[PDB]
């Protein structure tokens, strides 16, 4: 009678003790197979099972006992991935076929190391696309990895890093440990890791949770990805918290909001399987069966291995099918399955051929083995809140379809960030001070317009040259407009508008200064030329073709310089960096990076220096001329004393301002206040000196 | 003749002055010394006086 | 302390009387006091009538009559000893402390002999009186302002007679500028106290406000100079 060997991790200690739920499934499958008369004609399937406790050494001892006993086993069934690795590697020497119902190790796909190995269980790489999709959905790019030093987790991590590199996610830290995660968790905290993927077994998961609590590696900043096939109750702590120094409450608060991913492994349909039973018909079974074994299925959804329970059923059914599908006795009557020996590689080859070509619909879905293989299963995403697991959605890797149920319960309602990022904050002038400057500037513009209307007949003010005063008023009004465009800055404009307003500044301020100081310089120079230079010889007053010449030439030179330097080098905006500062709100884990907008270019500094030098030259020349025409008085240009004081004040203010502005440009508020106040005081004082005596003389 | 009348008036005044029965200066000096000696005690400025009876203290 | 209530009442009465008297003396000091005089009303030229003529300072013949008016927020008190005779030292010594003394000299009298006595001429009498009234121990710091009255008649008369009738020592040419300079030199050479005492020759011409305006200028100058000397700047 067809007899096979089995290895089931039931007892405990460590690893994945899925035997407690996969052994009753194996018994049910064997009962179903032996009750079918047409499946194995005149044959029954007998399983010589044993307990390995996920220990590779105990698995090797069990395999030795199975392979050195009287009945020659046709094939072997193994559970835990760690036991599966050793058993499948060693079984190549006995020509034994090994079927691993619960081994997820990606390293078991190597056909060179494990030639005679088959797996109903999907590879652990199934969770990797789900994890990467989860990272992409929430905008995560810097993820750490904490893994246990095992081949299954090492292979899963290798595949995950390969897919992350192919996707664009950077691996920050790769901590690994054997049994104690204290140093690894400490290094996780040291490297400032926010998103951490955890690949452990249940006991190592509990120790990692204890390290989480004892090192505060949780809360509103750390998101932990766990494995989904832990027990629902025991994922935080339910079984053996005696070794852990923490208490169930500490584990529950520490395990809050961590995401788990897992394959479904149950037939998510209604069609009958090969055994003529639905998935729910096998769920009603194996629930009563586990009830008779003491497990409280009333509240806890069965022990570990319940999620993988259909895999053992499908594995036994596939074993029966492959034993039936051989039919090589018909081709050669001498050879039969009953006469299989560990030396015979022919019957082993036929068994492998039958196993590879099997394909049916089981309780776990479609069982195709190495024939199709991939058939990436639908994965389930869940999150632990208040000590309970709430499903968040499903992801189908083959169809790239993520059916999301919005139930995530992030701390504070905001998704945690993968890092602490700096925020570019623009610094601008204070609004009250801007309004204070703007009101005075508007008053100056109104006064200039009113005096312009006043001047433009009566010989009291027509005795003096009125056209120079009107041009001066034009220039000063333009200068207050310049102050306005200087103050409005980048707070009221977009980044693409700053070059335009900056060019408008550099043009219109220069033209206003040129107009005003040209009027003043022309007046004093005309006074000098018509009284002092003409000396005793007179009979000739002042008139056009002399006064307009200097001011028009200066304005034309200023305009030409402006146009040449603007065309040759336009104005761009540069952002001056300021140092990192903690934000006022500590809840947001983002740094502040203040900055101040400025204007400059490659040739902007040299052209600015040249225009400043020209302005200084004309200022000094005008001041010297005003000093030289101190006592000189003209009947026609009687306004020479006031113009002299205005010129002296203008030169002094410009020379005191431009160095100071170049120094304090870093402080936007102080620089704007100084420039605006200097221009306002100069402008208003010039208006008063030139025009107020004229108005009071007209009135009186 | 205003000058003659003034001279006559001055001469008459001088004659009237000469009509005074002038006495010896010895008697006048004796009267002065007798008055000064008799009134020496009743002179507040001469005799030192206590502050209590002095109005100014 | 030990003073009784009636002592406090007497103290308060003394304090209020003293405060009133101090206030009265304070407002009485700002009124300038002058003293016009000359050679016996010969050089008067109705100078006192100029204020009545302008009338800007609007509202017995025994001893001295006082002229009271105000000019540019400045009260003017002006005293004249009209035909006082008597003895000069009797009342001159009480007129010290005046802001200035107005000495008026009649320029029309350059060719007219004094009516009081034909032996000596009028300008000589004015000269000796100026010597007597400028060099007193009282008027040692009092500034003097000089009025040249009726100078139009002097100008209209100099072209008909030489100046040697009373100034033989001057050989200069007969000219208005030369005659005026010689007269000023003769009058100012009598100032033996020129170090600390200042002299002004603000003349008078017709019924114009210029005379009183320059009189105000002169008294302002005198006050300012006195204050400057008081504070140590002169």
């Amino acid at each position: 009678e067809l007899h096979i060997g089995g290895i089931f991790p039931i007892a405990g200690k460590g690893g994945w003790q899925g035997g407690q739920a996969c052994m009753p499934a194996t018994r049910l499958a064997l009962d179903d197979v032996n009750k079918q008369p047409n499946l194995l004609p005149g044959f029954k399937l007998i399983l010589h099972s044993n307990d390995s406790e996920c220990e590779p050494g105990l698995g090797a001892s069990v395999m030795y006992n199975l392979l050195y006993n009287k009945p020659q086993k046709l094939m072997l069934l193994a559970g835990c991935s760690t036991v599966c690795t050793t058993v499948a590697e060693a079984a190549k020497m006995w020509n034994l076929i090994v079927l691993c119902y619960g081994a997820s190790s990606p390293a078991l796909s190597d056909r060179k190391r494990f030639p005679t190995l088959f797996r109903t269980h999907p590879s652990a790489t199934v969770h990797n696309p789900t994890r990467i999709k989860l990272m992409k959905k929430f905008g995560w790019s810097r993820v750490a990895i904490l893994q246990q030093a095992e081949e299954v987790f090492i292979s899963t991590v290798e595949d995950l890093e390969n897919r992350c590199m192919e996707a664009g996610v950077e691996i920050v830290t790769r901590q690994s440990f054997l049994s104690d995660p204290t140093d690894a968790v400490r290094n996780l905290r040291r490297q400032d890791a926010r998103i951490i993927v955890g690949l452990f077994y249940v006991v190592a998961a509990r120790r990692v949770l204890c390290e989480m609590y004892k090192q505060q590696l949780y809360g509103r900043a750390h998101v932990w990805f766990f494995i989904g096939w832990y027990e629902d109750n025991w994922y935080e702590v339910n079984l053996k918290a005696e070794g852990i120094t923490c208490t169930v409450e500490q584990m529950r608060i520490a395990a809050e909001g961590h995401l788990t991913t897992e394959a479904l492994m149950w037939n998510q349909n209604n069609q009958t399987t090969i055994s003529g039973m639905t998935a729910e018909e096998f769920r009603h079974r194996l629930n009563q069966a586990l009830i008779e074994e003491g497990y409280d299925i009333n509240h806890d959804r069965y022990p570990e291995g319940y999620q993988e329970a259909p895999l053992a059923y499908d594995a036994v059914w596939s074993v029966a099918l492959a034993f039936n599908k051989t039919m090589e006795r018909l081709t050669t009557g001498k050879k039969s399955l009953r006469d299989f020996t560990y030396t015979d590689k022919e019957i082993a080859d036929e068994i492998y051929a039958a196993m590879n070509s099997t394909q049916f619909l089981g309780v776990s879905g479609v069982v195709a083995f190495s024939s199709q293989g991939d058939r990436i299963a639908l994965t389930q995403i869940e999150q632990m809140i208040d000590g309970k697991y709430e499903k968040l959605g499903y992801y189908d890797t083959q169809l790239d379809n993520l059916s999301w149920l919005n139930t995530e319960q992030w701390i504070g309602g905001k998704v945690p960030q993968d890092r602490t990022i700096v925020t570019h904050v623009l610094r601008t002038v204070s609004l009250p001070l801007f309004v204070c400057m703007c009101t005075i500037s508007s008053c100056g513009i109104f006064v200039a317009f009113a005096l312009i209307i006043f001047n433009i007949h009566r010989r009291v003010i027509q005795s003096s040259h009125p056209v120079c005063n009107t041009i001066m008023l034009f220039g000063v009004i333009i200068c207050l407009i310049s102050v306005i465009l200087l103050g409005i800055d980048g707070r009221f404009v977009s980044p693409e508008e700053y070059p335009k307003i900056c060019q408008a500044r550099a043009w219109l301020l220069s033209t206003g200064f040129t107009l005003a100081y040209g009027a003043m310089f022309s007046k004093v120079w005309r006074v000098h030329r018509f009284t002092t230079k003409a000396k005793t010889d007179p009979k000739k007053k002042v008139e056009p073709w002399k006064l307009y010449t200097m001011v028009s030439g200066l304005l034309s030179i200023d305009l030409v310089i402006l146009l040449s330097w603007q065309i040759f080098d336009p104005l761009q905006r540069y952002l001056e960096t300021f140092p990192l500062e903690d934000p006022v709100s500590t809840t947001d884990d983002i740094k502040i990076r203040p900055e101040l907008e400025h204007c400059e270019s490659q040739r902007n500094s040299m052209w600015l220096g040249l225009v400043y030098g020209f302005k200084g030259l004309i200022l000094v020349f005008g001041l010297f001329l005003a000093y030289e025409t101190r006592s000189i008085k003209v009947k026609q240009i009687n306004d020479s004393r006031y113009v002299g004081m205005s010129i002296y004040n203008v030169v002094v203010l410009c020379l005191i301002t431009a160095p100071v502005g170049m120094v304090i440009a870093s402080q936007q508020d102080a620089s704007f206040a100084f420039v605006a106040l200097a221009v306002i005081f100069c402008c208003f004082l010039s208006m008063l000196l030139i025009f107020v005596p004229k108005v009071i003389e007209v009135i009186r | 003749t205003a000058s003659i009348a003034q001279a006559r008036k001055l001469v008459e005044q001088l004659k009237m002055e000469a009509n005074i029965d002038r006495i010896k200066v010895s008697k006048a000096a004796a009267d002065l010394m007798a008055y000064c000696e008799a009134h020496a005690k009743e002179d507040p400025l001469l005799t030192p006086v206590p502050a209590s009876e002095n109005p100014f203290r | 302390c030990t003073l009784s209530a009636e002592d406090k009442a007497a103290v308060e009465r003394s304090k209020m009387i003293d405060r009133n008297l101090r206030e009265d003396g304070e407002k009485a000091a700002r009124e300038v006091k002058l003293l016009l005089l000359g050679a016996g009303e010969s050089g008067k030229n109705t100078i006192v009538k100029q204020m009545k003529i302008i009338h800007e300072a609007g509202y017995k013949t025994t001893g001295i009559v006082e002229t009271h008016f105000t000019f540019k927020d400045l009260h003017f008190k002006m005293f004249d000893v009209g035909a006082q005779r008597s003895e000069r030292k009797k009342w001159i010594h009480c007129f010290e402390g005046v802001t200035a003394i107005i000495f008026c000299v009649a320029l029309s009298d350059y060719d007219l002999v004094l009516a009081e006595d034909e032996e000596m001429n009028r300008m000589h009498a004015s000269m000796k009186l100026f010597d007597s009234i400028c060099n007193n121990k009282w008027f040692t710091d009092t500034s003097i302002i000089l009025f040249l009255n009726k100078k139009d008649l002097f100008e209209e008369k100099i072209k008909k007679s030489p100046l040697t009738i009373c100034y033989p020592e001057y050989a200069g040419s007969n000219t208005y500028e030369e005659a005026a300079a010689y007269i000023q030199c003769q009058f100012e050479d009598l100032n033996k106290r020129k170090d600390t005492k200042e002299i002004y020759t603000h003349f008078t011409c017709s019924t114009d406000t210029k005379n009183v305006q320059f009189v105000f200028d002169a008294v302002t100058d005198v006050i300012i100079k006195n204050n400057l000397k008081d504070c140590g700047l002169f």
Binding site: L178, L653, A670 | - | -
Partner: protein, 700 residues
Amino acid sequence: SDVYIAGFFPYGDGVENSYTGRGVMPSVKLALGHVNEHGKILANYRLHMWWNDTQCNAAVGVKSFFDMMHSGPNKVMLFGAACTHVTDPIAKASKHWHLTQLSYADTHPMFTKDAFPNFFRVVPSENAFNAPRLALLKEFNWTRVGTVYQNEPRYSLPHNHMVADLDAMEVEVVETQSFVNDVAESLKKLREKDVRIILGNFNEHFARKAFCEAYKLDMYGRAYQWLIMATYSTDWWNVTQDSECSVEEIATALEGAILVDLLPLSTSGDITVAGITADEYLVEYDRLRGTEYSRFHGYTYDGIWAAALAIQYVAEKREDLLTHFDYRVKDWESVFLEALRNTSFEGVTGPVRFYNNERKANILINQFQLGQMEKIGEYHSQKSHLDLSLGKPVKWVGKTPPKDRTLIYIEHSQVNPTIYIVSASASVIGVIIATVFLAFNIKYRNQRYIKMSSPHLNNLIIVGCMITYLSIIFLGLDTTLSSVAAFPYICTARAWILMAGFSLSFGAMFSKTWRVHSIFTDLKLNKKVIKDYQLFMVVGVLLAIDIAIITTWQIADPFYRETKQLEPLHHENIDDVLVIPENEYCQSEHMTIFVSIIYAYKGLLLVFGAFLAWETRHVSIPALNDSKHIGFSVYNVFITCLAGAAISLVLSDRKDLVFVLLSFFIIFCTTATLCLVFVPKLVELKRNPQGVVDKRVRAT
């Protein structure tokens, strides 16, 4: 008797790691012969090895172990295979046969005592290389280190142990980096953190790759020191066709690196348990090996001797001979465990004593000196003694070991002392001009025009201007010549000097104008005009309130000196030695309040003086008409102090053009005031007619 011990060696020709077994077999034969011929050790028993070649194959090793346990001469101990993937299944299975195992060439840091209770290692694991590197860090005074390790458990578990050791020993770890194949990015991240001493855990291939990237990133010389654990093959750096850079490049980058490896044979000359020394054993091994060599020969010799000692201990403890051995009885396992935990003897590799199933062995230290690997010294693990006086002396690039960190230096600022000397010359010239004016107004003090100007108050003005000009000397006085404690004294001296100069000059001028106003506004003949000593007392009272407010500020808010802390630290060098400049600017918590108060009352004085000037702006006396000079001086001073407060209150890293600006401010103010008040007083008597005779006065 015929005691047998099972052995596993990769002896097969052409198999991976065949050189190890082929080179250690002669040592096994020598040790077995020595034990058999030894009368004292195993007198009544003859030791044999029943060894099977494993071909570095897990399946073959497992099959050989199963065959050994099934039938044969009843082996009593196992000699663990060199290959890790062969030792792991055998070591895990051997516990359930109640057998103890001895290693001879396996150093993987995963055969811990917790997971492998029966596994005794005669060769130390890779965690043994952590202590010598810590001792090297302590010897050369290294405290700042960085780590780069391969993402393999063999190189990541000892890395975690070493990081924990460094944390417990108080050595700062800058940044630990892992790699799978990209060493270049890990080295770049190490460089970006300014790491000088680098600890490396990687295999020979990645060692060559890492040094290639070190050359490509310039990680050699006297600035970087490499401390790597190197159990690599002989002349590993002299191997081509495996690195991008040439052999010469590798030898260039590898120069000076200290490499830690296991010492094959003890060099202490002690007599071992065999009766010979390590030198005689080496002679015999060289004669008997032929052409096969392995670095573990002494360790296998010691393992054979330890197995013989344990067998003798077991035979002496229990009277029953080993012919009654049984795999199913835990008593045999307990007795053998006690025997191997009581093992203590001297072997050719040193003293053998199992502490936590592992022994402490001498560790050989090497360095790359002049293109060759020369031994520096040797670390004795049993005594924790780092003895560097054995091999060639350690050779650095210069004469000292490379230093960690950057060795920053907080340097002061000279602030262009040439500018300081120029400002001192300008202040000296100003003082000379003030002295000339003092002489001019003192000699001619009895002249009418000079006397009318109150020459004593003019002398006060001159003294104030002299003090203000002297203020520049203390303004730019660098803290280098003032030490540290005198900085607040210097700040107070400068503040009071400026305040006193301003007070003297402007109080004297305003007192002059106040007296002129009192003279010219009341018009009283006999008036109590304020005298000179009263004005002196008023100016003294003004300077007294100045000293009073500065005293109150000093007894209330001392000067808490601060620094700019310019981070740039100027240019750097190859060794990254930089000097950080720290400009000094004394500050107080109440500086703003004091500055506001002083500016407020000085501005009140300024408007009072301007009011006095506007009152006595019409004085006809030329010497008593100081209105214009007061106006000009007040305007200049006010604008200058506003600009100076603006410059100083936002003091920045410039501190050089700032000093020039303040010096120009003070010089311009003082000189402008002096040449405004005395120049008319000098051109009116020394150029215009000397002796005030009132030539233009109509009254005079």
